[PDB]
Design a protein around this ligand. Structure first.
Ligand SMILES: [Ca+2]
Ligand SMILES: [Mn+2]
Ligand SMILES: [Mn+2]
Length: 430
DNA sequence: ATTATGACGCT
DNA sequence: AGCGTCATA
C-alpha cells in the first residue's frame, strides 16, 4: 500500500492531427473542405492508393489502403487530392513542411517528442506545476475545458453527445480536490487545460484541427487520444484504468498490435488488457522476456515509465520506392536511373536539413527487395556518406548492391528488384 | 499491386 | 552491423 507506486508522477499528452494529409489538402483547396475526400498516391493502378480519409468519407466506409476506384464504389462523390510526384516518385514534402508548422507551435508549450509525421508527445509535468501556482487554489471552470471528455464519466445515479460530455465533465470537476497541489487528478486536469490552449493555438495558427489524450504516461495518452476523435481531447485518469481496461482488446495498446500481442492472447488465453493483472511479474517475464514481462505487468495496471524524449526532428532521412508486379527493375540502367532519382530527392532533403537544423548525416543505408521475397526488405547494406552529392550517393549505392545481381549478364538484373531504399543516418552537429 | 516512410529491439 | 517488429500518413 504505502510503498506501491502508481505511476502518477507525470502529466503526459499526445496530440494527433485529425485526418492530417486531408486537412493539409483542404487548407490549400477550399473546395475540398467539409466534403467526403481522401488523399491518394499514384492514379494509374485502380485510381491510386488512399493514404488519408476525411471523417465525412469514413461515414461511407472509405478507409486507408483502399484503391480509389474501390472507394468510389462506396462513395461516388468522394473527392480526391493526389500526392505530388517528383522524379518519378511520390514526394511527401508538403506534409513534412505542414508537420513542422505544428511541431513548432507545440514546442512553445513544452518539450516534445516527435512520434510521427502528425503527432507528438508532450511532458506537461513542469508546465502544470507552474499553472497550479498561478491558479492559487482557484477552482477549474468547465469553460476552460470546452472540448474535453473525461473517460468513464458520467456514471451512476440527456441523449445528446455534447450533453453527455458536459455531464461527465461536471461530475469530474465537482469531485476535484483543488486544494492539493500534488493530487494526480488535479494535475491531469490542469494538463487538459493547457492542451486545450495548445490545440486552440494549433488551429488558430495553421487551420488544422487535432485530437489529444492526457494521462500519466505515453501509452495511456495515445490510447486516450483516440477515444473521441475528431477535434476533441480525452483525459484518462489513473482511476479510470480498471474499467477502461476490462473490455479493452490487447491489440489496441501501443506495441501490442502485432505478433507480441497475438502471443499474449494465445499463450495466456485472454482477450482484454485488464485480464493481465492476474499473472505475476515472473509469469509474464517467463513468456515474453524480462523487459516485456515487466512492462506488461505495470502497463495492465496503468503504469509505464517511458520518457517523452526531447526530440523534435526525425533521426533519419529516407527515400523509398516500390516497383510492383511487372514494373520490377530488370536492367542495370533501370536500377541506376532509379537510384539516381532517389539520390536526387535525398540530396535535396539532406541539403535543406543541413541548413535548417545544423547537422550532417554520415552513413548511407541502401536497401532492396527481390521479387519473391515476402519480407519488406531483402537486403540492407551501409556505406560512408561523406558528401551531399546525388551522383556519388547513387554510384555508392550501386556498388554495395551490385553483387546481388545473380544474372550472368551484367546488362540484366535478376531477380528483378521490387524495391529501392536510400536512407541517410548517423547525424553529427555541423 | 497499398506505398512511403521512421523509431527501436535483437543478436 | 544487418535483420525484424511495430508504427503512422
Ligand atoms: Ca492523425
Ligand atoms: Mn498519428
Ligand atoms: Mn491514422
Amino acid at each position: 500500500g504505502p510503498h506501491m507506486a502508481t505511476g502518477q508522477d507525470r502529466v503526459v499528452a499526445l496530440v494527433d492531427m485529425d485526418c492530417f494529409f486531408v486537412q493539409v489538402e483542404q487548407r490549400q483547396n477550399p473546395h475540398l473542405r467539409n466534403k467526403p475526400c481522401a488523399v491518394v498516391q499514384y492514379k494509374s493502378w485502380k485510381g491510386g492508393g488512399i493514404i488519408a480519409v476525411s471523417y465525412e468519407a469514413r461515414a461511407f466506409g472509405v478507409t486507408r489502403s483502399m484503391w480509389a476506384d474501390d472507394a468510389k464504389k462506396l462513395c461516388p462523390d468522394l473527392l480526391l487530392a493526389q500526392v505530388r510526384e517528383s522524379r518519378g516518385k511520390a514526394n511527401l514534402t508538403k506534409y513534412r513542411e505542414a508537420s513542422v508548422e505544428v511541431m513548432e507551435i507545440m514546442s512553445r508549450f513544452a518539450v516534445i517528442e516527435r512520434a510521427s509525421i502528425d503527432e507528438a508527445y508532450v511532458d506537461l509535468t513542469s508546465a502544470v506545476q507552474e499553472r497550479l501556482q498561478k491558479l492559487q487554489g482557484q477552482p477549474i471552470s468547465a469553460d476552460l475545458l470546452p472540448s474535453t471528455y473525461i473517460e468513464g464519466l458520467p456514471q451512476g445515479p440527456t441523449v445528446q453527445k455534447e450533453g453527455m460530455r458536459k455531464q461527465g465533465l461536471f461530475q469530474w470537476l465537482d469531485s476535484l480536490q483543488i486544494d492539493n497541489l500534488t493530487s494526480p487528478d488535479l494535475q491531469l486536469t490542469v494538463g487538459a487545460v493547457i492542451v486545450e490552449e495548445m490545440r486552440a493555438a494549433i488551429e488558430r495558427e495553421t487551420g488544422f484541427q487535432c485530437s489529444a489524450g492526457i494521462s500519466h504516461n505515453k501509452v495511456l495518452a495515445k490510447l486516450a487520444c483516440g477515444l473521441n476523435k475528431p477535434n476533441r481531447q480525452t483525459l484518462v485518469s489513473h482511476g479510470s484504468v480498471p474499467q477502461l481496461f476490462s473490455q479493452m482488446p490487447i491489440r489496441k495498446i501501443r506495441s501490442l498490435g502485432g505478433k507480441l500481442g497475438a502471443s499474449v492472447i494465445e499463450i495466456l488465453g485472454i482477450e482484454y488488457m485488464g485480464e493481465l493483472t492476474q499473472f505475476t511479474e515472473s509469469q509474464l517475464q517467463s513468456h515474453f522476456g524480462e523487459k516485456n514481462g515487466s512492462w506488461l505487468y505495470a502497463m495492465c495496471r496503468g503504469i509505464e515509465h517511458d520518457p517523452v524524449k526531447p526530440r523534435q526532428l526525425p533521426k533519419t532521412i529516407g527515400c523509398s520506392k516500390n516497383f510492383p508486379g511487372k514494373t520490377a527493375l530488370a536492367t542495370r540502367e533501370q536500377v541506376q536511373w532509379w537510384l539516381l532519382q532517389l539520390a536526387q530527392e535525398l540530396e535535396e532533403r539532406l541539403t535543406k536539413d543541413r541548413n535548417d537544423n545544423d547537422r550532417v548525416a554520415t552513413q548511407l543505408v541502401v536497401s532492396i527487395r527481390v521479387q519473391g521475397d515476402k519480407r519488406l526488405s531483402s537486403l540492407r547494406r551501409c556505406c560512408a556518406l561523406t558528401r551531399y552529392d546525388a551522383h556519388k550517393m547513387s554510384h555508392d549505392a550501386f556498388t554495395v548492391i551490385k553483387n546481388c545481381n545473380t544474372s550472368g549478364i551484367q546488362t540484366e538484373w535478376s531477380p528483378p528488384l521490387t524495391m529501392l531504399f536510400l536512407c541517410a543516418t548517423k547525424f553529427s552537429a555541423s
